[PDB]
Amino acid sequence: TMAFQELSFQSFNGKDNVKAWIYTPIRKPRGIVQVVHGFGEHSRRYLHMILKFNEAGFVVAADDHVGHGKTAYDSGNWGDWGDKGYMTMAEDEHTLRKIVQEQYPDLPYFMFGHSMGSMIARGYAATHGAGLSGLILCGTSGRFPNASKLLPVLKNLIYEGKGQETDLSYLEELMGWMTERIEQPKTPNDWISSDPDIVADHANDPFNNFTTPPNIRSLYYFVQMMEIIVGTEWAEKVPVSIPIYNIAGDQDPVGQYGEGVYAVSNWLVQTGHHVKTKVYPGHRHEIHNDRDIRDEVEEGIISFINGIIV
């Protein structure tokens, strides 16, 4: 058996080589947690959480998705998720899962996803959820504003040959509203946290994407991933054998300031799932990075997982 590992595998899109890591506990492993990062960030922002999971006895698997992190940094491809459709990221998560479960075949397996990573996790739980012991969603979305609107527009642009073109105005339409509750925001990303130092670190980290907006087909995929997970029509597809932990800050626009986070919990409860929810008052998107609650947020996830393994 192997401990800390660097690995890589070919993407579902057939062109990108996905960079990934496995972190193992020193104690006898009790479970696996697969960590799925969000839009424009990367998996090594999560080292603090990963080490907490390691010290709880959990193996941790994480990759940098196509267009992100070391995957984008090594290839130079920051703006194209490829030509195989919106499930590309969920399929790459499935590949990493099979790799880590080949090394640890008999452990309870949990998936954690933050932001777009919770959208990937939610779609994954509806397509590959067989075998999951638990699902943790952080900073997830309800019905995301303007997403329905851009879907046909982007789809038409694709069939017109514009798929690999880049246009910043579509992302700004999708995302530009998100500082709306913030008095005088210094940056368009101030909604990630009310701590300016976290926003500045996010901006200064070269493995986050501040160079290239995603091209038109990649934006299409993003909006598809937002829309395919909406309502009980999505929730019914998630096996009720998977309990769900749903956490967010109530100043977070992604989840409509607590309302859409509880809407998602309701969709799942309505369809027969066991759901535990926790909304942290007065916090924006990245509750797991806010330093005044970070330890509490991580302990809550571990306590949820321990409750299932027990």
Protein described:
It is a single chain. 40% of the residues lie in helices and 16% in strands. With 310 residues, the protein is of the alpha/beta class. It has one domain (1-310). An eight-stranded mixed beta sheet has the order 1-2-4-3-5-6-7-8, sandwiched between helices. Helix 4 crosses helix 8. The longest helix is centred in the first third of the chain and has 16 residues, at 88-103. The relative contact order is 0.15. The PDB classes it as hydrolase.
List the helices and strands and how they pair.
Layout: E1 5-10, E2 17-23, E3 31-36, H1 47-55, E4 58-64, H2 69-75, H3 88-103, E5 109-114, H4 116-127, E6 134-138, H5 147-162, H6 168-175, H7 196-204, H8 216-228, H9 231-235, E7 244-249, H10 259-270, E8 275-280, H11 294-309
Parallel strand pairs: 3-4, 3-5, 5-6, 6-7, 7-8
Antiparallel strand pairs: 1-2, 2-4
Order of helices and strands: EEEHEHHEHEHHHHHEHEH
**Overall strand count:** 8
Most strands sheet? 8 strands, mixed
As a percent range, the share of strand residues is 15-25%
List the quaternary state of the chains: monomer
Strand order of the largest sheet: 1-2-4-3-5-6-7-8
Radius of gyration: 18 Å
Structural class: alpha/beta
Our count of domains comes out at 1
- Compute the separation of the termini in Å: 25 Å
PDB class: hydrolase
Keywords: carboxyl esterase, lipase, alpha/beta hydrolase, hydrolase
Assembly: monomeric
Entry title: The crystal structure of a highly thermostable carboxyl esterase from Bacillus coagulans
